[PDB]
Symmetry: D2
Subunit: 387 residues, 4 copies
């Protein structure tokens, strides 16, 4: 049970409640299996069901079936889906926030009419590829080379850490078009790869600590022909598209840790008042009361920060400093909240029959696998150095 202190309107509260209701029956009872089997068998049907609620294209234009709402509703949906399951939350983020929004921002008429319709309805799954086995933070150091042989581009290289890679029908891959660039940043271009393109293949899904179920794999390009129309933006200006939405991307990414902390609380608060020790509830001891208070305060502070920054980006004033600070705070507080959740459960939180360990294993992903806290700190630092 959340509060009205967040400042949500009725429309946003109705959305949050509907998403919670849908997840409690369609995603919540499966979170334990998805993590155990490291697979989401109903991924396609769950996507088709999410595309019927209008949350996939929550921010895309209504012209292509989207809802046309702001980024606060997107953060709410992300928080709910991550409260139901972290892996599916990360998948929804990679699909609707990294791929769809990138196309509505930089996609031209033909591409937006070809891909978005099926991307907002759930027929296609989306993925974004800007990381390599040797370039995860030094993104400009990618080693996927695309050479223009006339009206086509021959792509060769590898891409790693691609969420929804083995299930995505449309992918946005950044390939180095000219290694001889004055800055390297001016030598990368964005390409739209489709499933079935000769020369494009995927690797075996990764076995990760947490967020198991969000299929991450490697993209192998062996002389892959990409038409000249399948370029997002312009040639050699791929960094423009790469950085155009990074702030709004880290903004929506902050919803995952919020949902994980909410789930941790939803299991810690009731358990502490049922389990008893020394003749009284364990949730009545001063230490556990202070732990609960600290967890609740951290969760509420992060929630208010993220929601305020989201409302701000919805009005016109949207910066990188705050979009990075929100995620730096949320991803760093979620791990401590998860640790406290396991410490509150004790011996029962250490067995994989309770979801206390999954929350911890999933909250660390946002710290080292979706942008590092070190890079988010330096972003704010350099934003202060430029003023």
């Amino acid at each position: 049970v959340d509060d009205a202190i967040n400042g949500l309107s009725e429309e946003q509260r109705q959305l949050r409640q509907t998403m919670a209701k849908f997840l409690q029956e369609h995603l919540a009872p499966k979170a334990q299996e998805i993590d155990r089997s490291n697979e989401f068998k109903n991924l396609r049907e769950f996507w088709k069901q999410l595309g019927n609620l209008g949350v996939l294209g929550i921010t895309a234009p209504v012209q292509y079936g989207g809802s046309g709402l702001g980024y606060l509703e997107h953060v709410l949906v992300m928080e709910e889906i991550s409260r139901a399951s972290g892996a599916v939350g990360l998948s929804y983020g990679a699909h609707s926030n990294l791929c769809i929004n990138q196309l509505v921002r930089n996609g031209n008429e033909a591409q937006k009419e070809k891909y978005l319709p099926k991307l907002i309805s759930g027929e296609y799954i989306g993925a974004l590829a800007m990381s390599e086995p040797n370039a995860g933070s030094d993104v400009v150091s990618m080693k996927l080379k695309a050479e223009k042989k006339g009206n086509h581009y021959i792509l060769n290289g590898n891409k790693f850490w691609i969420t929804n890679g083995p299930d995505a029908d449309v992918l946005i891959v950044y390939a180095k078009t000219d290694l001889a660039a004055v800055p390297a940043s001016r030598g990368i271009t964005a390409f739209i790869v489709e499933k079935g393109m000769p020369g494009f293949s995927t690797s075996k899904k990764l076995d990760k600590l947490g967020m198991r179920g969000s299929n991450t794999c490697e993209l192998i390009f062996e002389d892959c022909k990409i038409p000249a129309a399948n370029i997002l933006g312009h040639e050699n200006k791929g960094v423009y598209v790469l950085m155009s939405g990074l702030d709004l991307e880290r903004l929506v990414l902050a919803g995952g840790p919020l949902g994980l902390m909410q789930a941790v609380l939803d299991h810690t608060i009731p358990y502490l008042h049922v389990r008893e020790a020394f003749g009284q509830k364990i949730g009545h001891f001063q230490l556990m009361q202070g732990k609960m208070a600290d967890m609740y305060t951290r969760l509420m502070a992060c929630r208010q920060y993220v929601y305020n920054v989201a409302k701000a980006c919805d009005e016109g004033h949207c910066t990188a400093k705050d979009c990075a600070g929100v995620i730096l705070y949320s991803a760093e507080c979620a791990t401590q909240v998860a640790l406290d959740g396991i410490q509150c459960f004790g011996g029962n939180g250490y067995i994989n029959d309770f979801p206390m360990g999954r929350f911890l294993r999933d909250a660390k992903l946002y710290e080292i696998g979706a942008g590092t806290s070190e890079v988010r700190r330096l972003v704010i630092g350099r934003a202060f150095n430029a003023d």
Copy 2:
């Protein structure tokens, strides 16, 4: 330079700008001396100026010369005054929040038309006395005994930790009327004492670590005859008025830790781009960048939390759990940020010529003074036990 991300209206932004200009012109240049001499020799003139500005009754009805605004504007004014001077911020909070709001909630019309006008105009200074030498947290265990004699009450005892005691003309003390109450709670009565009442005196001001300038002393009552009309609320019900506005009090007192953090930032950020080491600005090393990011994110999160909780209490939904969590989080983060503001200043942060140490010495009070962190943690905990 504050950001329009917290969701402030045009009128609130203009109020903040006016307060900042007035404090930069009249209060800020003296903040260093008020702490050196442990006295604000222009206290009454500054109070009259604040009353002419209309911020001493920011939350008081317009019937008594107040502004009649919400608690968000009160938090803004407190934050600004504490950004200028923490001791004067505490003195203003002990006059407008602990005293003026205590009279517009449990005071009859006669007690209001007599004290509130001059308390809002700046002629009278206000103080609250609900703590004793042996009762800091266990406020229910008082030793200031008030025995009725006809239509008057003979008060005898001592009260400790009374802000503005030496300067207050109207103080709200809590004496113990019924020394037979099975619940001590209903054995306390609130009395409105005035400077000059025979049998009421004050001790010498305290010499505290920080907040030097907010005159705190001990009140002595020796056969103090108080009329039966100078009693706040109903006799033997002096815990209802004590808890009637404790949540709003903790909310309005959360601005001090906000102003202190904003002040340490306004000295750390400009200083890290004027000081150089190893040939480059010290604000360019990754360690200082991470420290800046951490403190800025903490300040922003605390600001969003407290501002949203204040906006909630101005709409009819005002809870005690969040009103305690905000103050706890803000008091902790303010000390944590002040400890990193002295580290970003090097040896210059250890000399009393720079304001870095004063910020820490003033922020520690919000953690140990004006309510303890353990009490707030236990309140937040017991807010879950009853559910």
Copy 3:
């Protein structure tokens, strides 16, 4: 490469090096499988080899096959075994410390000659059973009943959280002997149970977050007949033998987190000088350098504290306050050190192919399992109170 600053002798360093050489070829290369399969297929033969090395009875008398050494050597062996695999380290701590030492302290000549030889040689595996499905911290609220039937005892009940349960041949179980004692403490007795006893069985091994491979199950007693000679200590005096070594148990169990921290450091430090970002090694950036410094300082402090307390308990001066503080500090620092180590690997630190996640999942047991941080904190606080 550990530092010889803790103050070890030449024989202690020889033991450290021998155990390291043995475990770098017999245990270390299997740690990834043991955690993946949740089973140590070579448990019995590895135990026979460990007993041939002379560390299973490192603190047992030479008369029964032990080594007659102190507790510092026990801590060193525990650390060296947990450095290669935390699960096998916990199993070694459960057998060599909670079972053997308990029998050499409280056992009689017959009990010391019937079990200790094979317990030290490796033929027999040992376990200790005090915890129950509803008594983890409240160790005097057990629900295992033992009714005296002439010269025998009929045991009925169950026990939970028992290390080496499915593999143990000699177990020490605490059962309630009188349900009418003024303090419950006076109605508990220890019993030496042997595998193959009519009326004793075990449950399926638990699927735990970490320490996978250290078989932990539930002991089911259904009218189990235990002779009277199998009583460990004296009937109705079970808490005296349960608290006779709790201090030394907490002391020796502190080596686990030390080994886990040493392992995460040995895996991180070399990785920071190979991985390259932005041209230079990632270990040349100030943030990673500070993280390495913090991890190294925490590890060194924990090691010094544990080793000094172990040297102290070996000379006659041994206290519960320090034996609890060492384990509390080590377990609380190991989790943060493993978190930062995962933070030092990036995406590679989130895939199960690297051992960074296993370290975090194992270090968390020493804060919830084998004791909790709150119990040790309260023990220290009450030791302070008793002064």
Copy 4:
């Protein structure tokens, strides 16, 4: 009361007992006045008594009056003197460690008899000048020009943060003898400035947040003539002296925070069993018990670390990163311990009539003064990339 878990010999126990018995009579009763007046009125007589005791030249040969002991006995005296007064402890660390060890290490037979025989007895007070108003951490970026004009050197410039300056008779200063070196590291030389030399002047005392009583000032040299025989080491090789006086300078300065933590504990533990709240001693509450436990464990871990690193340095094994980590841990733990002690004292911990605020204000110097947390972290990090 100290516990003999550190592994101290009988001689060291007796030394600590004597130091405590002396400081409880001659230094402890006057610490509050020393902090208030920012001056020690019995500095010379106290020093001479400390020389008659024999703990000034503790780590110095017996020839010149020293005791001929190790660095552990030296850390013991530093801890015991900072336990009674942090400012006098810093002054003693500046005179006994930064002026006498540097003289026995890099001093000739002529210099080791003109100054040392009266620096070990207390007649002369010692200081060291490596910090200037423009370089505290970039200690290579000194600006103090020394011109060789035959049989003398002419010094011109200014220095800053000089403990014992206003009272030191001998000062080991550093000056740029060659401002055109390829590395600026080799353009520096050390000199022995004796008080009274024409040209050398001391500025006015500093008004610091803490350590009030340890007089600090600026060193102004305006054409100051120094004989060539007063050269410490050799010409244009002053970085060698500065780096030789670095590891054993960071090691011994770790007793300061240890003594401050011990002092805060000696006031918190007895005060939490006398103060009453809610009808019981505040020392019996779970939160206060956990605070006491955490403080005791941190103090004990820091003590074990510092004393083990000092025992390894008394047998030959010294390491830069270990001596930088001991203090990095001790100083960072002392501030938290002082904050927790102030929290445990409550309102009484905010008035200057209690020594908690003094402990806090003094524990922050070791994090900014005598080095920085960032510098020590970066040193420890720079100790790994080299392997």
